[PDB]
Design a binder for this molecule. Sequence first.
Ligand SMILES: CC(=O)N[C@H]1[C@@H](Oc2ccc([N+](=O)[O-])cc2)O[C@H](CO)[C@@H](O)[C@@H]1O
Length: 155
Amino acid sequence: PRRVLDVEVYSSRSKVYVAVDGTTVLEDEAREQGRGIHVIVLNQATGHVMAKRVFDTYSPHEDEAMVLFLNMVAPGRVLICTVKDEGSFHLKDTAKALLRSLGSQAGPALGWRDTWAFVGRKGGPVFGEKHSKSPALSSWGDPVLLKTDVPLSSA
Ligand SMILES: CC(=O)N[C@H]1[C@@H](Oc2ccc([N+](=O)[O-])cc2)O[C@H](CO)[C@@H](O)[C@@H]1O
């Protein structure tokens, strides 16, 4: 609304979405597309979407692309991450260390078919995070819907 953004972030086996101030900026419910970690970067004064990516970190090399991308994001941006299906198999140590450095608690621990939603300032702090661990190899984490108020910059 004013000096705040209302952000909603959904992570699940079959669907991700992100809404900012009641507007859907990401929605992917397609079968067999969009696996991995979805990353949205917002301008920290307006909430406008600066970048939207998906890294299929179930597959090799995509976490390296994610690291290169995230390292170019400015510290003040709002960073949103959400998993569709599976984002951990090839989320390797450099990517996990990068998520840890953002203050993410669940990202560095992401496991097989876990669901994960994250909203934070690139240079810290984290504003909201949710995580559900998959209970079995044949299962997924529970869908998570994170609703977070994000402060906006001004002056
Ligand atoms: C057909 C299917 O259901 N494929 C799915 C399966 O792929 C695999 C393939 C092999 C193994 N295995 O035997 O270790 C596990 C998951 O899981 C992936 C991660 O959730 C999905 O992206 C694929 O869409």
